[PDB]
From a paper:
Here we dissected the structural basis for neuropeptide-gated activity of a neuropeptide-gated DEG/ENaC, FMRFamide-gated sodium channel 1 (FaNaC1) from the annelid worm Malacoceros fuliginosus, using cryo-electron microscopy. We solved high-resolution structures of FaNaC1 alone, with full agonist FMRFa, with partial agonist ASSFVRIa, and with both FMRFa and pore-blocker diminazene, identifying the ligand-binding site and elucidating the conformational changes induced by ligand binding. Each subunit comprises a minimal N terminus and a nonresolved 63-amino acid C terminus facing the intracellular side, two transmembrane segments (TM1 and TM2), and a large extracellular domain. The FaNaC1 structures presented here capture a ligand-free resting state, two ligand-bound desensitized states and a ligand-bound dilated channel state.
Preparations of FaNaC1 alone and with FMRFa (30 μM) yielded 3D reconstructions with a global resolution of 2.7 and 2.5 Å, respectively. For both structures, density could be unambiguously assigned to amino acid sequence based on mostly continuous main chain density and numerous distinctive side chain densities. The 63-amino-acid C-terminal tail was not resolved. To establish how ligand binding induces channel gating, we compared ligand-free and ligand-bound FaNaC1 structures. In both ligand-bound structures, however, the channel pore appears closed, with radii of ~1 Å at the level of G503 and G506 in TM2a (G3′ and G6′ in a TM2 numbering scheme). This is similar to our ligand-free, inactive FaNaC1 structure and is too narrow to pass even mostly dehydrated Na+ ions (~2.3 Å). We also observed a remarkably large conformational change in the β5–β6 loop (residues K200–G218) of the extracellular domain, which flips from a downward orientation in our ligand-free structure to an upward orientation in all ligand-bound structures. This involves, for example, L211 displacing 20 Å and is a notable exception to the otherwise immobile palm/ball domain. Thus, the H297S mutation increases gating efficacy. This suggests that WT resting FaNaC1 channels are energetically primed for opening but cannot do so until ligand binding and extracellular domain rolling releases TM1/TM2a via outward H297 movement.
Author numbering:
A (entry chain C), B (entry chain A), C (entry chain B): 2 to 203, 208 to 529
The structure:
Amino acid sequence: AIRDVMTKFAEQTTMHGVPKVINAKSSMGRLFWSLVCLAAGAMFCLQMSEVLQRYFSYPKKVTVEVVPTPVPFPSISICNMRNLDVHILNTLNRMFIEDDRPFSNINKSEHEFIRAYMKKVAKYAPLFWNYQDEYPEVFQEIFSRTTFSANIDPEVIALAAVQLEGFVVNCHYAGHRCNKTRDFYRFFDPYYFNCFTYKAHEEDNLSEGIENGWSSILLSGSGMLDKNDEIRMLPGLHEWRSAVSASEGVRVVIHPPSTTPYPFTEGYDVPPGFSASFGIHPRRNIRIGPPHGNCSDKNPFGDGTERYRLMACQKMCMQHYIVETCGCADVGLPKLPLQANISWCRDDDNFPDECMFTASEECLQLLMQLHNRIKCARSIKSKITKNTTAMEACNCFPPCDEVSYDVSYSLSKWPSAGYEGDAAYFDVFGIEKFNERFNKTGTQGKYELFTKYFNVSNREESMKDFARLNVYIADSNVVKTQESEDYTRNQLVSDIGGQLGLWVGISLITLAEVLELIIDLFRL
Amino acid sequence: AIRDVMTKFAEQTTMHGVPKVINAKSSMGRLFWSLVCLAAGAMFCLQMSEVLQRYFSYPKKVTVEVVPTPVPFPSISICNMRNLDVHILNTLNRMFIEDDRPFSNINKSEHEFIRAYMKKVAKYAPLFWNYQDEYPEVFQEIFSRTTFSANIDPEVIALAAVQLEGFVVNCHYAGHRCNKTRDFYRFFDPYYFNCFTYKAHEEDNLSEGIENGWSSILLSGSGMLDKNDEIRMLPGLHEWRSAVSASEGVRVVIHPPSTTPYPFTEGYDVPPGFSASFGIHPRRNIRIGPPHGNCSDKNPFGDGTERYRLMACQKMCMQHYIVETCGCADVGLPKLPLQANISWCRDDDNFPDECMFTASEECLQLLMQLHNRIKCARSIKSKITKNTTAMEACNCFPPCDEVSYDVSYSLSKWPSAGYEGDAAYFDVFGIEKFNERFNKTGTQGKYELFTKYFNVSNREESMKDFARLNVYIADSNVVKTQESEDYTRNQLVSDIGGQLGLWVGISLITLAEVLELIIDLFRL
Amino acid sequence: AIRDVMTKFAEQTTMHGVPKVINAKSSMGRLFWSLVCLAAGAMFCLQMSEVLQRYFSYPKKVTVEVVPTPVPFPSISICNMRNLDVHILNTLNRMFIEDDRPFSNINKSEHEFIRAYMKKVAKYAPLFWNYQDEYPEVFQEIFSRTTFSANIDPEVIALAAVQLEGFVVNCHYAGHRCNKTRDFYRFFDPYYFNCFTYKAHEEDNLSEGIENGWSSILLSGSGMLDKNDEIRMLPGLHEWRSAVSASEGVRVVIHPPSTTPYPFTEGYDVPPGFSASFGIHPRRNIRIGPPHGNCSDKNPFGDGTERYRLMACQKMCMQHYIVETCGCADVGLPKLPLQANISWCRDDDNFPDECMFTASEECLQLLMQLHNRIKCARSIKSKITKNTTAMEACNCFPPCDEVSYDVSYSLSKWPSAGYEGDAAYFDVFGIEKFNERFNKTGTQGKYELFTKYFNVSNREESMKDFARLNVYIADSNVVKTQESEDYTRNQLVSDIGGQLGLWVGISLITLAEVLELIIDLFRL
Ligand SMILES: *[C@@H]1O[C@H](CO)[C@@H](O[C@@H]2O[C@H](CO)[C@@H](O)[C@H](O)[C@H]2NC(C)=O)[C@H](O)[C@H]1NC(C)=O
Ligand SMILES: *[C@@H]1O[C@H](CO)[C@@H](O[C@@H]2O[C@H](CO)[C@@H](O)[C@H](O)[C@H]2NC(C)=O)[C@H](O)[C@H]1NC(C)=O
Ligand SMILES: *[C@@H]1O[C@H](CO)[C@@H](O[C@@H]2O[C@H](CO)[C@@H](O)[C@H](O)[C@H]2NC(C)=O)[C@H](O)[C@H]1NC(C)=O
Ligand SMILES: *[C@@H]1O[C@H](CO)[C@@H](O[C@@H]2O[C@H](CO)[C@@H](O)[C@H](O)[C@H]2NC(C)=O)[C@H](O)[C@H]1NC(C)=O
Ligand SMILES: *[C@@H]1O[C@H](CO)[C@@H](O[C@@H]2O[C@H](CO)[C@@H](O)[C@H](O)[C@H]2NC(C)=O)[C@H](O)[C@H]1NC(C)=O
Ligand SMILES: *[C@@H]1O[C@H](CO)[C@@H](O[C@@H]2O[C@H](CO)[C@@H](O)[C@H](O)[C@H]2NC(C)=O)[C@H](O)[C@H]1NC(C)=O
Ligand SMILES: *[C@@H]1O[C@H](CO)[C@@H](O)[C@H](O)[C@H]1NC(C)=O
Ligand SMILES: *[C@@H]1O[C@H](CO)[C@@H](O)[C@H](O)[C@H]1NC(C)=O
Ligand SMILES: *[C@@H]1O[C@H](CO)[C@@H](O)[C@H](O)[C@H]1NC(C)=O
Ligand SMILES: *[C@@H]1O[C@H](CO)[C@@H](O)[C@H](O)[C@H]1NC(C)=O
Ligand SMILES: *[C@@H]1O[C@H](CO)[C@@H](O)[C@H](O)[C@H]1NC(C)=O
Ligand SMILES: *[C@@H]1O[C@H](CO)[C@@H](O)[C@H](O)[C@H]1NC(C)=O
Ligand SMILES: *[C@@H]1O[C@H](CO)[C@@H](O)[C@H](O)[C@H]1NC(C)=O
Ligand SMILES: *[C@@H]1O[C@H](CO)[C@@H](O)[C@H](O)[C@H]1NC(C)=O
Ligand SMILES: *[C@@H]1O[C@H](CO)[C@@H](O)[C@H](O)[C@H]1NC(C)=O
């Protein structure tokens, strides 16, 4: 009954092509309609292959527009390019002037940082004097600022580095004084030592204008320091081999409110004696998930107490690779929160005190091992950069909701010549009374030096050591860059419907027809 | 005849599903085909709900591309950070040196601005001397530069502020001299007093290169001013509490040719003694209408004689809210063109002259009312910023066709050391003959001071007071950001057609079928 | 048999509308169904006109996203704003001090460049002394730096201009010393004379951080030059009429590795005595072909040995138009590689030596022709800019795959005051031994001057002539802007299918139906 069931199907079905093939007029008619059906099906499949290829590519649609939705005021991190305090540096210069031998200066100072620095210098110097020419590269790394920072307790350095009271002369967010003890947070940098981060107390709307922004006056000069008739250097502290080296000014980093700043990768420089204007144009980027792109809401290596950034993830991935291979952490990269209690690669590993007296081969072997650790870390950093598979293995992706800022950099000398610039001196020393901050028991030396240097007669030259920062929102409207799926499932279904209705002519109520036909064939 | 009409319909209709339900093979067949039809309709409706939700969302499509279509050369507005003329400031300093009492200096000068300033200072001082400690905040606002600008006639300040002849030493657009009297327009700023806007005489194509741009030399230094052995201040004029304060240099704003500049929100700073290069990269943004977005072709609060900007609309909305509530206009925001004849909030409201002799409680009550007005304006400004509904109520939207500029900021000391820098002095004083401009009857004092200060021997130090601005188009091709409707009505119709042809199988020539069926049912 | 064939067609066809028109119930029925068919067809055609208008518009889809794919480290081109060597300039100043007459100084120097310069000055001066007032404009162009560069052999200028050994004190890419003879390439600029381009030796991944970037120290000051008691000028070399003129510092251009820099259109300025930080944010733009946009993979006027840029194409198009009309090439635009051996427009065309003795009318006519050539070139440059058809005729299009860089500009005084800045002097003169480079047979004069100027006691002032550049990648992730076709042929086919299934109801297996019908009509 195959002929009968196919004939009944052809007479009752809605399939637009089958009846002509079944109820053919002649052999040539059946052949033609067969080739028409074949051609329709072939073009159908060829087009659907392209359609499904487009869909499974998972394209993205990106829109850029200006929206009034506000973003939080950026956090400002300031690092003084002079890492140590003026008094400590002057004291060190005077001691090295008085006696060049570091061994004689171990217990000559009341400051713990000076004593530790002298101990380290005395422990390293005899080997330097004996083996400088034989192994110059080893001592080029041992006598470095980062190396000393990794071998001295951070709590000891923090008391000798730049202090907030001696760095931020004045602060003003909007029309109110900054709560200097509530808004400023101190964090440690291997090269800049003490650094300070400003966080505005708080969603809220963003106000425009310089007067509505963040204005601060900082002491960043080095004219207070003693001037030497001949060049003399503090070992380790003065590093001519660094790319920053003897730079004078402030390193300013503009970043979201709850993110770790990275001065050596991002930020801006402000010379002393100039007023820097930072016109901030906010931006927001919204990203979508795995099938269409890559984004992450949290740092894989983090602890979940900081706003996510891709730079932090990449740096922590590099640190993870360094720790895994070399067995130590690089001081130039953040410590892993989940893998604490890891010694720095530049740590001397309890370098013995007896090396101060004899430059024995054992002490040199310890320094050799330190240099080998540094070289291991450096090689791992370079290898991983080219090793793209390692970067992908860390699963570092851009944030799914990122706030970023564009900076309009500008400069202008802050203390004007003549009586125009007297306002700066009156504010710093007459109203804020900057000198009287240091009239304390343990800060008398700084007080006398600032009293002598900043007297009224030398106003024009002395005031050049100060700098002013103005961080203001120049455009309250935020440029939003939102990513979205370009080709959804509904659009895919619509395209499939159009192609089904164009080429083959069948529908879903008509693909039931063939289902009933196959049931009838089964139960024939 | 219901059965007959439905049977005839099923036998003659093209509806792909109904005939199987009507001409059912059996009860199970009718049930199946009914559930197939129901399922098709349900999926149809579920997909069309999503489709219509997408359509009525009115999505936008944004394209970013580089096009050769030119944009007009940007207008350049320059404000000298020294608001007053050198002669006026020196005279004021000398008078305050000679006699500290302002009452004795009312009629001691021939300049009207000096007389008005002395009158205001003498009217405010007795209350300051008596009530400074009791009400410090009130006098912190009364003795302000903005307050004095709002209580002195602008036509009086304009003659004492910085003049164009004494500010723009030289100008050159392309290879031709700037028409200094045709291209420069003076406008008043509450803090910078006199400011000047350059408008190029003119669509036209944009030329690249520094030599094809706008080059000008300006006198912005303050070394000409007298240097005092002790700090003495001009009340109101010197404001240590401002975020700009004693800054020295030029405030440069780059904006479209026919727009009001806003130096305190946008612009760049140029220190004296440096050559500033402003590499301009033009941009154009095209936006579309209400159903898909928000854009406006004209400022709602404006008069229609200026190119539209969103910043102007927002500032005028803030001014409108201030005037409505406090009954006065803030001097820090533009005056409303449609609501002229409104006194500033900082206006003293005809403060009597008798206060110069007695510090009576009545005079203090008038100052108290002035302070209350200032505080009302400040509170309204802060409240409206958080009050997002007010911002929406002003109907401020970004322009539908906006031209914007990106600035590449750079600096370099303009007068080179040695004979290299002699070209600057030769141009300023040998060819332009800058000193001989001031050899007039009412400008002799300035002429002598410039003759003494800018002599040949002191060339190296004296020339540091000048600055040079170079504004040039760095990329003649414009980055265009055009917004367009992503999902048009035709695309919606195509998607509806695809879905109709996929799920239900009906068409419009087939939805006539049911129309005839219902007519037949009516006329049965 | 027309009625029979149409009836059989209507009874057997799947066309959803024709059977109702053919097998009409009544006259009103036939009329209605005819108008329904007409309406369906009309709406169909109206929608397809819009669809085809959208398709043949060839719209583009642009996506902006952040990707980890690296781009090559940018090439850095540095031009000293002091074009000539210190020794040559000092010698010229001394000779013009000793004797003002240029004719007496023809053979007084051993340097070939000085002799050629004196010959040119002596050939031009007698006409200048006689006809300065009559034709000031002619001599304003003849006595120009560009004019002298076009009339003196480049190989002669290169030996007298700034040398690499006396310009780049130190270089460091990543942690390694730059191969100063392999990575630096010298190229000639008409205004800056000798300029140098740095190309990193090498796809490769991009490393972040200042210490991983390019750090260099350059001598760019002019304090070494003799200071004159009175203003005296070198004719042609000192050009007060230029927009750059007496600027002191370095012109820094950041561009892709294999592209010609254009300092006068792109770049940044760095003053001496400051450390410039160039935070590089890379970008990549991908563009598509003729039907959807315009892009080119190679410069039409180029030789195919340089990475394509639109700026180069536009400049070479301008040069092509200048050469075609004026018969000469402008020195301010690149020479056409395919049309070499073309004299500059500013070339004096073998100006005779006899003019040194007599200011005859013939010599003035030659200078007049030179001025006419310059004016022709200038007029052609201006005319072509407005002549948009010429710009289109050159077929200059943006590159199909372009790499661009965004620069974060910052400054900070490099040599710190006091012992902090001793590192810079120790590096320059103690380790690099900058003075000892010039202790050669033909450079003794420079050696003595640098020995005297850079002594230890004058460390603070003398070191201000140096500058430091730090070019580092601030964001290793690249912002990609890719253009793609928005409306493909497959989408067009899907929309046609949806519209065919919505309005008219026909398919392709049903447009065969009418093909068989017309065959039957033919063979009736
Ligand atoms: C800066 O902020 C701190 C912390 O909020 C303020 O100190 C607190 O003040 C409140 C009263 O306002 C007290 O109850 C707390 O005991 C104080 N200490 C702490 C640790 O919270 C301080 O007053 C603020 N300074 C200014 C000038 O407002
Ligand atoms: C999201 O990130 C993953 C990272 O694994 C991407 O997958 C990699 O894609 C590259 C090519 O771009 C391949 O070479 C790798 O082999 C892929 N990884 C693996 C594990 O196979 C993925 O393509 C990214 N998604 C999007 C949309 O870009
Ligand atoms: C600067 O522009 C002004 C205004 O166009 C010029 O002054 C006019 O010059 C024309 C002739 O060119 C006269 O008919 C007008 O009477 C002048 N005055 C005004 C108010 O239009 C002036 O000549 C231009 N300066 C230069 C140097 O070209
Ligand atoms: C155009 O602006 C209007 C401003 O009224 C927007 O409508 C407001 O939308 C916000 C949410 O974004 C609501 O909270 C407000 O209640 C809306 N206003 C009113 C009066 O109801 C509108 O959404 C904007 N259009 C687009 C496309 O963004
Ligand atoms: C800088 O690069 C040049 C060119 O590669 C080096 O000179 C070549 O060195 C190789 C051996 O490494 C020799 O075979 C070639 O003969 C040298 N000359 C040339 C022209 O290739 C030079 O050694 C490099 N300098 C440094 C410090 O590495
Ligand atoms: C690619 O460039 C060509 C340049 O010829 C463009 O064609 C020109 O378009 C303008 C309008 O924008 C017309 O005025 C010209 O007449 C056109 N040229 C010719 C020879 O007719 C073309 O439009 C560009 N393509 C795209 C997609 O922008
Ligand atoms: C690159 O990375 C993969 C996976 O991290 C690793 O297996 C491979 O050894 C690496 N190659 C090199 C040369 O380090
Ligand atoms: C500093 O402190 C001492 C002791 O408290 C006091 O006598 C002296 O007046 C103070 N000096 C200043 C400037 O405050
Ligand atoms: C201010 O200090 C300087 C330091 O050099 C000194 O020369 C000058 O005499 C001092 N002035 C007064 C008034 O003490
Ligand atoms: C916010 O704005 C709305 C409308 O402008 C107003 O009714 C409301 O009172 C405002 N709220 C505050 C706290 O000012
Ligand atoms: C200034 O003007 C007076 C009177 O017109 C004249 O005698 C004198 O020479 C002028 N000085 C200069 C420098 O032009
Ligand atoms: C130039 O002015 C300065 C001002 O201090 C003065 O010392 C110098 O003697 C003057 N030179 C001449 C030549 O008048
Ligand atoms: C503009 O360009 C076209 C084609 O290059 C040319 O025919 C025409 O003459 C030009 N017009 C002018 C005013 O130069
Ligand atoms: C300069 O060269 C000469 C001759 O070679 C030598 O005597 C002298 O010591 C050199 N000076 C320096 C500073 O190297
Ligand atoms: C250094 O050079 C300066 C140049 O003015 C000179 O005054 C000084 O005496 C020199 N110092 C030494 C130690 O030669």
